[PDB]
Amino acid sequence: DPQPVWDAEPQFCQGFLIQGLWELFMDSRQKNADKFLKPLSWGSEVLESSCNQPSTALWQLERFTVPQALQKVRVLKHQELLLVVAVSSFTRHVFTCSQSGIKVWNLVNQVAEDRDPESHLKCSVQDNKVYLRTCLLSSNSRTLFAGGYNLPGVIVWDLAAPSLYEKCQLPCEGLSCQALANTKENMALAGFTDGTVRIWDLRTQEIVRNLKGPTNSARNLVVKDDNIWTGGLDACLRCWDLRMAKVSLEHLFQSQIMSLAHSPTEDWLLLGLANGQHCLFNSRKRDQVLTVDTKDNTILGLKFSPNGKWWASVGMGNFITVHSMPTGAKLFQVPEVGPVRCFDMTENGRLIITGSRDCASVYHIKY
């Protein structure tokens, strides 16, 4: 009903001068204040001034900041329905995944709207018809994982080599990937459609263990120091201990778990249900799950801040909302065109990429 109108957002100064020179040339051959946004300098920072505050923070409260607004700076033009987005600000790259391939973009380029990727990795020609579903990027930005529907395994790419080439296969013949995770012990794990979570040794490509649950119960998968948190359509959250290799905890929820996240610093676990309700669960004490919000639309994305003082949410409600962590109070909203299906945030907490229909918009976080 309410149709947001997209406008050419950046109009940087250099583009203004170039467009001015372009018009004069065509003007000659016929007879026969303005607002500019700050550029993303070097693909890293914006070089702006922080907002004012009513008071001064405590001496020990230095690195714990919350955002105030988001500003759009670029649109990356994928040409298919976007599914997943990843960043890894260490190398200033962006990975966008669709059902037919993964496009790699560089943030160093200063373009209002980017249509030329750094690389276009695909796998469709290998078999008769193969779809991709998900992609993952490791913490140190040296490995990329991709998983799909009809693949013979999850594809592993090396990103620290002089060339971009396929590395591993990690065999899984007749399953749909549906989830990916990585651990510090140099192991990989994935959770398929029929409830199996399989763990491979990354260096030898050898299957270490298989964990079995009910159908569609492994849609979301989070790894911690020695625990594995899983949840899906069956509306239950379970925790597996890798040592004793059975379920440890089982908690029942009133609606299907659509997204899961974990706080980097504290011991909180974030649940996003299909009725718009957020939930906080203590992963250590495990007493009771406390509901913080309510919405009319479903929730498809959830991610914590690098310092774990706030979080962001996306869904089918045309909006990207930011909430403060302590009590869950909403901070602000930013509208979009359609169902936002994926987003990601940089490690230094400066950027946020968001993929709505087939364009990935990158926003700068204003503190």
């Binding site: 693909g43 190398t91 790259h93 560089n106 160093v108 380029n109 750094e118 620290a160 002089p162 971009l164």
Partner: protein, 89 residues
């Protein structure tokens, strides 16, 4: 009048157009850089900068060229200078 160098795919082409150049004594340049290449490439991956060493000068001077954004150039230069200072002592 021709030098060849591999460029890793992850290095943007926009940062190959403004290098940083330093000169130092030749006897330190080869002993600090060394012969092996895996360690050098690992250092480039960490610093997100590329470095090249040229010793064609008839004198005792060696020229080191560093590619990257200014922070990367500064960090790599500090690493090289610290290693050279330790090695000379």
């Amino acid at each position: 009048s021709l030098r060849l160098r591999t460029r890793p795919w992850w290095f943007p082409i926009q940062e190959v157009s403004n290098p940083l150049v330093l000169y130092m004594e030749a006897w330190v340049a080869e002993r600090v850089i060394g012969t092996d290449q895996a360690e050098i490439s690992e250092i480039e991956w960490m610093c997100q900068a590329l470095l090249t060493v040229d010793s064609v000068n008839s004198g005792n001077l060696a020229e080191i060229t560093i590619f990257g954004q200014p922070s990367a150039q500064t960090r790599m230069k500090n690493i090289l200078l610290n290693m050279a200072a330790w090695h000379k002592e």
